Each structure stands twice: as C-alpha cells, then as structure tokens.
C-alpha cells in the first residue's frame, strides 16, 4: 500500500538532505 | 544537396525578347544565341573563347561553401 | 554486364606500342578503351606518315578509312580533335 | 599544425583536428550520399544513409557523425558500403508513396537520384504502406507530409536557423509524425526556407504547387530588391513568366536562405 | 563449472526473507566497510573493478572496471556524475526488479563505492516508471541512509558527498539505452545519441556521465569488501563472477537465482529453477540472454552453458542472462513474431533502418505465422535482417535482427513447412 | 467557357478565328464529373487506390483516412474515401 | 470512367517527347486537384514515337488507333486539350480495347 | 462490336463524327491558358 | 498523434497544479542542476497525471509554462512515452502483459477472460469508466509470467479466475490485496528454494584487510 504521490512527496522530504545544487 | 552541377563553369548568352505567340499561347523568341550555354572546364578558357569570338564578357568569380566546423557533441552542450 | 575478353584488350595494347615505337616522332599518346578500342593519338603534323604506314605496313594493314569526324571541345585550346578511324 | 592526415580512398588529404569523415571525402571531391546532413544545420544522424567503411573496422561508420582519425582509409566505395546504401534506400522507399508524379519535387528529389545513383533497381516490400495524415501548417508550405523521410531537418532549422522552436516529433516507432502536435501554423519569417530544406517533397510551396517540374525552368541568377541585405537569389522562369524564385547561396550575405516576402 | 554456495552468494536478501530496510541490511553488514574503500581512493576502487573482471551485467557486457575507468580523468571544470539504469526492460528480465525491490539498500552503497570510483558528484537511478511501488522501496531505503549520513555529506564519514536520486521512467524498453536514459534525465525525448561524442565525454547536463547496470552497481562494494580475486575466482576466465540466472516459461519453478556464471544451461534449469516442462526432451528452443539475444535450439544448448564467452562462441548473448523457455508446445513463429511486434510498438524511430526495417519485419513475420508467405521470402528477410544488424544508431536495431536471424538459422524447415500448409488449402 | 474558364474577351481578336468556325469545347468537364462519384465508406485507417484496373490504372497509393472531418482524395482519381 | 480526366500533369511526357511537340502548363485545379490548363500536342511536329504512350504514369495520353486526320489548314493540325480530349471521348472504346490487348505485354 | 460490346462510360459520345475539316465544326486552335500579367487599369474617377 | 481541439480535451479545460503539487514541483526541480529545469518535464507531467488522468493538452502547456520549456517539447514527451494517457482513462485502468514471456506461460487466457469479464473489449473502457482494459508490453515481472498492473500495482502470477476474484474485488470495496495471489513469494523457487536456504552471512566476513 503506498500514495499517488509517495515517490513524489517522498523525495521532497529528502530535499532537505539533498546535497546542494550544482 | 548534391553538387555535381556546381563543378564546371559555363558562359552563358544575355537573355532576349519571349513574347506570346497569337494562335497558341506558345513562347516565341527572335534570339538565336537563347538557348545555348557552353560549358568550359577551366575560367581561363573561358575568357579565351569570348575574346576570339569577340561576344563581351563579365565573369563571375566562383564562390565555394566556406569549411564549417561540426560535430555532434556540441548539441549536448552544458551552456550552448 | 557485357562479357569482355582480355585477349583483345592485349592484343590491341601490344600494336599500340608497336605502332607507337614505330612512329615516336608523333604519336603522343597510345590507349585502349575498356572496350577494347585502340586510339593512337598524334601530332597534327603526323597526319600523312601515321596513316601511310599504316595503309602499308606488312604487320599493320589498316587499308579502308571508315570514318574522319572532328568533336569539338571549346574549352580546349585546339578545338577541333579530328578522328581516323580505320579498318 | 592541427593537421591530422587521413586518407580517402588513399588521397591523404589532410584535415583540422574535428572533421567528419562525410567532411574528409568532400576536399578529396567525392560526394557521401547523405539526408538528414545539412551544412548550417546540426549533425543529426537520423537517416543512416551516409554509412562509410574505415579500412580495417568491424563495422561502418556514420560519415556525417564521425569526427575523422590518423590515418584512416574511408573506402566510400567499398562493396560494404554500397550495401550499406542498397540496404537503406530499400527501407526510406518501403513506407514512401509513390506520388512522384505529384510530388512537385519531381526532379528536385535528392531521394530519386540518390536512389537511381547509389540504391536498388527493384523493390521486395512485398508488404503495406503507412500513410500520415496531412497538415495544414500554413498558406506557404503544403505539408503532404506521408512524404516525410523523418530526417530532422526541419526541425532543426526550424530551431536553430530560424528561432520558431515549434516543429517537433510527436511518437515513436514508424508513425513518429514530424507535425505540430496541435495545429498552430508555422509562422514566421524564413519560413519558407523549410521547403528547400526537405529533401523529400513531402512539405513543398503551395503557391508554385503544380505550375511547373524543374527540369523545363530556365534558371537566372539574380538581387533580392525586396529588401537591403541584398540576398543572392535564383530566378527560374519558363517560358517567359518567372515561377519561383528560390535561394543560391552567397557566404556573406544570404548563406542559402532568403525571406519569406522575397519568394 | 557451478554450484555457487548460498555463503558466497552476494544478495542474500533475494526472494526478501530478510527486511530490505536498513535493519536486515546491517545483519547483512552490507554497510560495513564503505567509509574505508572510500577512503581508499577512485583508483584502487576502479582496480579492484579490473581485478573483478567484473563485465558487464547489463546488455553488452563491456568490461566493467575499464568503461568506469573512462571517467577516473581529471575534471574539466565539469561535475562528473553516476547514472543507474534500472530500466529493466528486456522481455524475461525481472533480474534487477529484485536488487531494487528486496536489497534497495546494496544498490544504496553500491552508489557511493561507484561513485568515488569516477569522483561522480551525484547519482540519478532511473527506475522504470511501470514499477512505482518498486520506488516507493528505494527512496525510503535512500532516505534511511541518509538519515544515518551513510549518503550526503559526510557520506559514511568520508569527506567525500554524493547525492543519490531516483528519476521516473515512463514505459520505454528504449530508455535503457546509454545515450537515451540520459536524454530521457535530460528532459527531451528518449532518442539515443551517436557513439562519437561518448557518454563519458558529453554527460548529461554536458557533465562527464557513466551509465551501469544495477546488478553492475550493487556488486562493487562486495566485491571490494571481498576483494577482486574472490569474484574473479567464481567465472571462467574472461567471464567471470557469479550472474543473476532469471528463468521464464516452460519451466517447473520459474525463478531467479544467482548461480557461478558460466554454468552449464542444462544444468540451470536442472540444478535451480526447475525441469523443462514436460522433461528436458520438450525443449524446443530457449533464449539464454533475453528477447535480444537469439534463441539456441536443444541439441547445442546443454553442450553449451551461460557465461558470455562460451555464448558469443554459440552466436548467441549471455545478455541480460535471462532464460526463456520454449517447449514443443509453441509456435515459435509466433513467439519470435510477437518479439517482433514488441519491437516495432517500441523502437524510438530516430534511425531508418531500424523504424522501416523492424516494422517491414513485423509484417512478414505476421505473413509467416499464417504461411501466406512463400519459401524464397524466408532468405528475404535473412537479408533484411543484416541491413538493419550493422547500420543502426543503436543497438536495438542490433537486437530486433538477431531472433529472425536465430529463426531462420535453426528453425528453417519449420518456416518452410507453415509456408506449404497454407498452400495446400488454397 | 472552357475548363478553365478560357473565354476570350469581347475585344479580342482571336475571336475571328471562331468566326465561321465551332470553338472545340467538351461539355463533360471533370471538376464535375468526379463530384457525381459518391464517397467511398471504407472501414480501414488506411486504404488504396490503385486507380481501377491495376495495371491498367494509376500508380497505387495509400491514402489516410483518420480524420474523421474531411475525406481522403486520391492524388490521382480524385475519388475520395471516407471511414 | 468516373469522368475525371487522367492526366495529372506530372509533364514527363513533355520531358521525353523527342520532338519538343507536347507543351504542357498546369495549375492547381478548384477543387484542388493537379491538372493540366493548356496541353498542346503540335502533331506536325510530332513523329508518332509513341514514347508518350510509354512515359505516362496514369496513361492519360495514348497511342489513338485513327490515322485518318488529314487537314486541309496547318493550325487545325495543331491540337489543344479539347480537341484531345475530345479525341479521347470519340475513340475511347477501341483504346480502352487496344490497351486491354497489349498491357500484359508492356 | 456486336458479339462483344464495347464498355460504355457515361462520357464516351453517341454521335461519333467525320472528317468536319471543310465544314464549320471544324477544330480551331486556341490558348486555353488564362492571361498571365494582369494590369493596373487607370482609375475612372477624374482626380 | 494530433490534438483535434474538442470541447472536453482542449484547453477550454483549465490546468492548475494543486498548491499543494507545485510544492512538489519544485522539489523535483531541486533534484536536476540549477539551470537545467528543463529535464524536470517528464516528472512533473507525470504529476500532472496523477493530478488529471486526462492529462489534456492544457495541462500540456501547464507542464511547459511551469518549466519554461518549448510547449512542443511538453508534447513530444508525451506522445512519445505510453505511460501518459493523452487521453480520458478507466478508474482502474488494468494493463495485461503480452510479450513472448507471458504469452507463454498463457497471457492470452488473462486476457480473454479480461476481456468478457470487463464485458468490453481490449482497447476500449466500461461504460462506468470504471475499468480501461489495455494490452500493455512486458511490465517486468516476467517471471511471474501471468501479470498485470491493474492501475499502479503489479498482480502477478495470476491464473484466469484469480483476476475475474480481483476484478470483483475492485467492483465491490477497493485494495483488493494487490500482488502475486499464489504462495511463491516473489520470485522464489516455486516449489523450495534452490538456494539461500541457508541463514544470511555477517558484517566483515570474508574481507580483504582494509
Ligand atoms: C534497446 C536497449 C535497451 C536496453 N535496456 C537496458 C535495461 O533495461 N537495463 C540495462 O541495464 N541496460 C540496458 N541496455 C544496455 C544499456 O544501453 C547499457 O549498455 C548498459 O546499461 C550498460 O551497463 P553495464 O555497463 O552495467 O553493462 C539496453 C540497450 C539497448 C540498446
Ligand atoms: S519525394 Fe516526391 S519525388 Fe522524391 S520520391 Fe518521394 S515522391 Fe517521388
Ligand atoms: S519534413 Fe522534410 S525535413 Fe522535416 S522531416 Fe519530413 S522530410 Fe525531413
Ligand atoms: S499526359 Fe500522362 S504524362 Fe503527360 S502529363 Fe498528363 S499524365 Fe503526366
Ligand atoms: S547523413 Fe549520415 S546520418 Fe543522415
Ligand atoms: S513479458 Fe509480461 S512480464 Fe515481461
Ligand atoms: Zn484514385
């Protein structure tokens, strides 16, 4: 069981991870 | 895009009168000299056969694609 | 594509330089097409000794002339280029 | 300096680091069959008809694409690469509608001739042919495009010699259509450059539609007065009325093109 | 020779049984040495990949350690960057769909080991957009990760960053391709590029890029940790390592399970997997490497086994390693045709030989399955087949020739035979 | 008067050529006559048009008749087939 | 038979005829067609090859069986579209018999 | 003709006619073309 | 592939993203390089879709504008991908796998029974929109040879009724226990593990020093 937008709002979550853009 | 009609020169006689014939429509021209393009390897011997038969002349010089560098790489440029 | 013999094209190259050393004095160029034609080509002025010898030459007897026509080429020098051929 | 040599066919010509191998044959004189390669237009490589073969290498390469090497023979006329041509022209005729007596670009076809100079006598698609339904791009250029050989060219130029950006492919697989997706019409100046540019007949000039085939139009090389960068054009008239006036290209002033009033 | 034991296998999570999170990943110790092999350096990572012997894994195989090795030149200004692809396209490939799924994790450093091998800045994996529920798996392992400060910054403790992303596929066999899964990153239209510019030289972004298979990205921290010899002692010689063996139709128990490479194809379907359906004697033909590769009929295959050298040697590709199965039962004309169809609806038609060959092949093949065709078009489209092998801008065009070539090669009397029933009927 | 509407003016001396004289003109004009043919209701995206009699008519051709507005129009016959 | 006349005026007919005979010049019709507006054989100058028979893609011009068409005025020898297609309506059941005969053999 | 009939096309004449050379029916030749250089006729209104 | 502008799918239908799914948006375009937005195309329409199946040509040009890109590219990538429907699409929306693989193991069954269990036909939806019956190429899972992807999940290893069950179950109530309804879990050796029977190995085992 998983959302429309799990990948999507998954990875927002991860943005703050994200490293620093180019 | 082929350029096999580019290669040889050729001197061409200064175009004339093409009035429309009365009873067809057809083309009609008083200029014998018309329909006749010599063709002449070389801008040399071309100036040579105007000046001996004594017909005027103004010759162009060739002018050739200049080289173009390409390569498909470019169109993945990181800033174009 | 036509069946072409090598016989000939031998044949007729070996004449050419028997022809041509016969005649050095004018012949200029001597060659065989791919169709196995030979064209002894000469200066102008060996018009009347090339033929002679050929008409009468025990090894080349070319007696009947079969054509004399002239193409011309404007862009060459010499415009006219009068052609012998000759059986 | 910067002067690599490679030889054509055993010509060593010798090219700055960076030509193609199409580039390389073209100073030694011989002329790769090409689509899809213009010379102001990118390297695209979408056709294939331009497959060379390099001496000594498994397989042959992409004239158009292939930035040249030391010492590189191109065997251009290599019995590979002739099948190699054979082969491709087989396939751009398979799906082609023979239309060729519509196709205004009757004569001015680098698809016949290159198809009666380095393809196939006959066919074996033995199969059917495709057809894409045409498009009303604008009131200049008739798009009959089932012609398409989906070369790119256009939409190339349409991007990068012209700025429009709007001519697109639209799928994949042998229905990739190169039309607006939506039908919005190409408007823009040097539109009519388009038409030059298809090798294929299948987008050609609605106004000159069917007045006349090239071979009958005398062809006089005149000054484009419409407007002041004075663009070098081609004036072919027959019969004493002109019918088209196309661009002859001019390096500094209009290099192969020329605007959509002055045509 | 085969018979890998489960101890030396590398993704003992396959089949799950243990939590794909991090957790089962930490029992598994899959995180254990990273930081050092980091610190270790690009070098000894990418010789390590040499020593591997590690190929491909993917479609072609190309040695692993010296196509990473690419881009171990030093930067021009431009951030290098790591690509995996997980399209996972090939007709009878669910190989990666496993490693993604039930160990996210070994792919997760499998990323950061790669990624100081190239000094890449930041990895994208390109994960089918079919399997959504397969993403929502990994990002949730990725965010574990970094949460830990396995991934980010400070990755694992190294001063070394590298950012991992994962980016939706949407339904292309094409995608996989090098050039393509790039473009498709890039944003236009998945067309693949020319050769000439290489992908390491134009990356994406025009940033030097390097493109792997999954399974080619999850192995190299093992095979660090285990060292090159280890793996490289599994294969035969040139081939080497153990490979994922994913078996499908006409066998017992269809499944995947990572064998020593090089083991005998008798014995794969025998040992693991299960039986031919209907005893090894019903085994008209398989496909050792996937729809690409072409089929071997059964007399040379038990001969023959799976490791690339042994296959290219059989005229056919160890591939993807995937083993489709074709009983007597089947109507291989037909099973070949509708590779042909998957083919033609796939194809991105950027290249003539490919978008006109492939589908002028789909019609004739359609032709020979009803044997409306007559026997002189059976060599026909022989020929047709190699116009489009040696003349595409990718390798597709490659594959769609190779099973009509494996088609005529072998099962030319069949062809025949469907091409006189129709005649008889009138 | 013509198909193309050739008439010569009402001033034009070409007209004494007709003085005395019938002007050949063919009351079946084809703008017209292909009109009379109906549209053919094919049931296939794509059909052809091998212009009647194979060989005996014009080069064939296939014609697309997706849009469902207008109908397809063989280049040729100047039949047109709709789906 | 539908009444559509053949030519399409792809002028390759113009192209081979031998003795310059055949002038053709063409517009896009109304109705949108391709057809030609002035097609003038000048039958004097014609010498009855018959390449245009051959040549023609759509064989709108053909061979026509009569040789009967002795004139008493040279200009009645030269022959517009009407007066060919009117040619063409007058004999086109022997022509379509004649080419019914020969086709297999082209 | 009688054994075989020919194929009639709703075009093909009826009255099928001689030699009308001497006769007024006679062919005359004329350009079918439309004119080519249209002018600029003066206005009609006085300026 | 061309939009005839008609009054449902034409952009008389306004597009909007959620405010909500523009926040999303711009995560997505964190992920590429500064500068390289562009690339964020397939992703956000996906987005789009997820917003309106339909996905019309004014969501097209929404994609575009919110990316700044060529409103041509928007529809090159979505006529050249098949994940985006282009088009009004069936609640459920199954796809059932054909390519040699399945079809070997039987596909074909699946979808005839699909085919008159839906009561419509493959290529078409039920009159209730409820269920878009599509004949979909390899989805992966092919070792499970008879699949389908009903909407975003992935039922495999399927046998004809098992399918007709999961239908019923999407017709009555809904999360009709998507996945492979048969023992094998995954893609196991149906019968018993032919390996990794044994217990998984440890942190360092087996390591080269350092
Ligand atoms: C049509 C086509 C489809 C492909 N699909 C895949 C795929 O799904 N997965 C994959 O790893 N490689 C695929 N490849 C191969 C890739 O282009 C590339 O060679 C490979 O991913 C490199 O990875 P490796 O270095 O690990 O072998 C495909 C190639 C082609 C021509
Ligand atoms: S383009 Fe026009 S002319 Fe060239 S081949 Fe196709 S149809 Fe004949
Ligand atoms: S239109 Fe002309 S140019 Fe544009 S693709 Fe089709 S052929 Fe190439
Ligand atoms: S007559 Fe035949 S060939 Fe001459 S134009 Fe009309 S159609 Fe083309
Ligand atoms: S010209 Fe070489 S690819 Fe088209
Ligand atoms: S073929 Fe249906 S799963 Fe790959
Ligand atoms: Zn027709």
Same mark, same amino acid.
């Given at each position: ?22 | ?67 173009? /560098? ?11 | ?44 002025? @060996? ?16 007696? /009947? ?7 011309? &080429? ?14 | ?119 196939? +006598?006959? %066919? ?77 007949? *299948?987008?050609? %000039? ?58 | ?51 591997? @012997? ?29 690509? &995996? ?43 089918? @957009? ?5 993403? %929502? ?23 070394? +960053? ?37 992908? *390491? ?148 038609? =950027? ?76 | ?18 003085? +005395? ?63 | 038979? /539908?009444? $559509? ?21 063409? $517009? ?71 080419? =019914? ?6 | ?24 029916? =006679? ?21 | ?10 952009? +008389? ?151 007709? $069950? ?6 009555? @109530? ?20 032919? /390996? ?10 087996? &390591?080269?020093?350092?």
């Amino acid at each position: 069981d998983y959302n429309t937008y799990t990948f999507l709002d998954l990875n927002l979550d991860l943005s703050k991870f994200r490293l620093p853009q180019p | 895009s082929g350029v096999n009609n580019t290669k040889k020169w050729k001197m061409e006689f200064d175009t004339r009168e093409r009035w429309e014939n009365p009873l067809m429509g057809w083309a009609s021209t008083a200029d014998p000299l018309s329909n006749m393009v010599l063709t002449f390897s070389a801008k040399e011997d071309a100036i040579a056969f105007a000046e001996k038969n004594g017909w005027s002349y103004d010759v162009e010089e060739k002018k050739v694609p200049k080289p173009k /560098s390409k390569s498909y790489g470019a169109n993945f440029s990181w800033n174009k | 594509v036509r069946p072409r013999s090598d016989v000939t094209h031998k044949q007729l190259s070996a004449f050419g330089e028997y022809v041509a050393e016969i005649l050095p004095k004018y012949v200029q160029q001597v060659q065989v097409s791919c169709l196995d034609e030979l064209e002894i080509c000469i200066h102008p002025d @060996g018009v009347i000794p090339t033929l002679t010898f050929l008409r009468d030459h025990t090894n080349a007897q070319f007696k /009947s002339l079969a054509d004399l026509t002239a193409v011309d &080429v404007p862009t060459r020098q010499n415009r006219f280029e009068i052609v012998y051929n000759l059986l | 300096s910067n002067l690599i040599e490679v030889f054509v066919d055993g010509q060593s010509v010798m090219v700055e680091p960076g030509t193609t191998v199409l580039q390389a044959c073209e100073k030694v004189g011989m002329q790769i069959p090409r689509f899809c390669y213009h010379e102001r237009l990118s390297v695209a490589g979408n056709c294939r008809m331009c497959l060379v073969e390099i001496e000594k290498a498994p397989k042959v390469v992409a004239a158009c694409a292939m930035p040249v090497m030391k010492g590189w023979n191109i065997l251009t006329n290599s019995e590979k690469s002739k099948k190699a041509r054979e082969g491709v022209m087989e396939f751009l005729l398979a799906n082609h509608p023979l239309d060729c007596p519509i196709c205004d670009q009757g004569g001015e076809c680098d698809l016949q001739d290159q198809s009666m100079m380095f393809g196939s +006598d006959r %066919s074996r698609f033995l199969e059917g042919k495709r057809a894409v339904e045409d498009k009303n791009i604008g009131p200049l250029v008739k798009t009959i495009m089932t012609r398409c050989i989906q070369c790119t060219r256009c939409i190339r130029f349409a991007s990068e010699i012209a700025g429009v950006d709007d001519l697109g492919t639209t799928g994949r697989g042998n229905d990739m259509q190169v039309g607006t997706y939506i039908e919005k019409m190409f408007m823009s100046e040097l539109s009519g450059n388009v038409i030059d540019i298809c090798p294929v007949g *299948a987008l050609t %000039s609605k106004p000159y539609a069917f007045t006349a085939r090239p071979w009958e139009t005398r062809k006089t090389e005149s000054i484009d007065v419409m407007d002041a960068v004075g663009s070098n054009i081609v004036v072919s008239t027959r019969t004493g009325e002109v019918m088209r006036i196309l661009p002859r290209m001019h390096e500094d002033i209009n290099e192969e093109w020329i605007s959509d009033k002055t045509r | 020779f085969g018979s890998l034991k489960d101890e030396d296998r590398i993704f003992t999570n396959l089949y799950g049984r243990h939590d794909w999170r991090l957790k089962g990943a930490l029992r598994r110790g899959d995180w254990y040495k990273t930081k050092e092999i980091l610190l270790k350096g690009p070098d000894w990572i990418l010789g390590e990949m040499k020593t591997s @012997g590690l190929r491909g894994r993917g479609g072609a195989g190309f040695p692993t350690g010296l196509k990473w090795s690419f881009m171990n030149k030093p930067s021009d200004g431009r951030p290098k960057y790591l690509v &995996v692809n997980a399209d996972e396209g090939e007709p009878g490939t669910c190989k990666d769909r496993e490693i993604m799924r039930h160990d996210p994790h070994k792919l997760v450093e499998g990323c950061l080991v790669g990624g100081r091998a190239m000094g890449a800045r930041a990895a994208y994996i390109y994960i089918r @957009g079919e399997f959504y529920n397969e993403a %929502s798996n990994l990002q949730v392992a990725i965010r574990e990760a970094y949460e830990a400060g396995l991934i980010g910054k400070n990755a694992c403790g190294s001063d070394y +960053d590298f950012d991992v992303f994962v980016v939706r596929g949407a339904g292309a066999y094409i995608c996989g391709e090098e050039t393509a899964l790039i473009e498709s990153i890039e944003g236009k239209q998945g067309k693949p590029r020319l050769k000439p510019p290489f992908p *390491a030289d134009v990356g994406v972004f025009g940033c030097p890029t390097t493109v792997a298979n999954v399974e080619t990205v999850a192995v190299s921290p093992t095979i660090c940790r285990r060292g090159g010899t280890w793996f490289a002692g599994f294969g035969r010689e040139r081939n080497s390592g153990t490979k994922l063996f994913n078996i499908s139709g006409h066998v017992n128990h269809p499944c995947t399970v990572e064998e020593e490479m090089s083991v005998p194809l008798k014995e794969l379907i025998e040992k693991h997997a299960g039986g031919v359906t209907g005893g090894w004697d019903n085994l008209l033909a398989v496909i050792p490497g996937g729809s690409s590769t072409p089929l071997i009929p059964k007399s040379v295959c038990e001969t023959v086994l799976m490791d690339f050298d042994a296959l290219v040697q059989a005229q056919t590709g160890l591939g993807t390693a995937a083993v489709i199965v074709m009983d007597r039962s089947t109507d291989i004309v037909k099973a070949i045709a509708r590779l042909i169809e998957f083919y033609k609806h796939e194809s991105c038609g =950027q290249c003539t030989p490919c978008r006109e060959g492939v589908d002028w092949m789909n019609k004739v093949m359609a032709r020979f399955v009803k044997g409306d065709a007559r026997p002189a078009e059976i060599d026909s489209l022989w020929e047709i087949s190699k116009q489009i092998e040696g003349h595409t801008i990718c390798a597709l065009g490659d594959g769609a020739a190779w099973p009509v070539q494996g088609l005529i090669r072998h099962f030319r009397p069949e062809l025949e035979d469907r091409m006189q029933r129709f005649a008889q009927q009138h | 008067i013509t198909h193309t509407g050739q008439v010569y003016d009402e001033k034009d001396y070409r007209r004494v050529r007709f003085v +005395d004289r019938q002007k050949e003109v063919n009351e079946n004009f084809a703008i017209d006559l292909i009109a009379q043919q109906p549209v053919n209701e094919v049931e296939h995206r794509i059909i052809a048009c091998d212009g009647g009699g194979g060989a005996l008519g014009h080069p064939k051709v296939y014609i697309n008749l997706d849009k469902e507005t207008k109908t397809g129009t063989c280049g040729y016959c100047g039949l047109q087939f709709k789906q | 038979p /539908s009444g $559509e006349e053949r030519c399409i005026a792809c002028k390759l007919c113009e192209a081979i005829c031998p003795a310059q005979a055949i002038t053709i010049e063409a $517009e896009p019709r109304a109705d949108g067609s391709r057809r030609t507006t002035r097609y003038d054989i000048d039958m004097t100058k014609c010498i009855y090859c018959g390449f245009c028979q051959e040549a023609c893609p759509v064989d709108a011009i053909v061979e026509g069986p009569n040789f009967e068409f002795s004139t008493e005025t040279h200009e009645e020898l030269l022959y517009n579209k009407e007066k060919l297609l009117n040619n063409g309506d007058k004999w086109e059941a022997e022509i379509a018999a004649n080419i =019914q005969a020969d086709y297999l053999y082209r | 003709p009688t054994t075989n009939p020919p194929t009639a096309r709703k075009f093909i004449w009826t009255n099928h006619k001689f030699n009308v050379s001497a006769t007024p029916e =006679q062919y005359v030749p004329y350009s079918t073309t439309r004119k080519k250089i249209h002018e600029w006729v003066p206005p009609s209104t006085p300026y | 592939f061309v939009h005839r502008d008609t009054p449902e799918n034409n952009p +008389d239908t306004p597009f909007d993203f959620t405010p909500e799914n523009y926040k999303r948006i711009e995560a997505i375009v964190k992920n590429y390089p500064e500068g390289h937005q562009a690339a964020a195309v397939l992703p956000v329409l996906d987005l789009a879709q997820r917003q309106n199946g339909w996905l019309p040509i004014s969501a097209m040009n929404k994609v575009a504008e919110v990316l700044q890109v060529p409103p041509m590219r928007v529809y090159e990538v979505a006529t050249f991908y098949t994940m985006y429907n282009r088009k009004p699409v069936g609640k459920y929306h199954i796809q059932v796998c054909t390519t040699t693989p399945c079809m070997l193991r039987d596909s074909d069954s699946i979808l005839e029974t699909l085919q008159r269990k839906l009561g419509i036909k493959v290529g078409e939806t039920t009159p209730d929109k409820l269920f878009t019956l599509i004949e979909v190429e390899c989805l992966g899972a092919c070792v499970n040879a008879p699949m389908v992807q009903i909407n975003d999940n992935y039922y495999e290893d399927l046998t004809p009724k098992d399918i007709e $069950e999961i239908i019923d179950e999407l017709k009555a @109530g809904k999360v009709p226990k998507p996945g492979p309804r048969s023992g094998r879990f995954c893609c196991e050796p149906a019968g018993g593990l032919t /390996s990794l029977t044994e217990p998984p190995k440890g942190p360092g085992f087996g &390591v080269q020093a350092g």
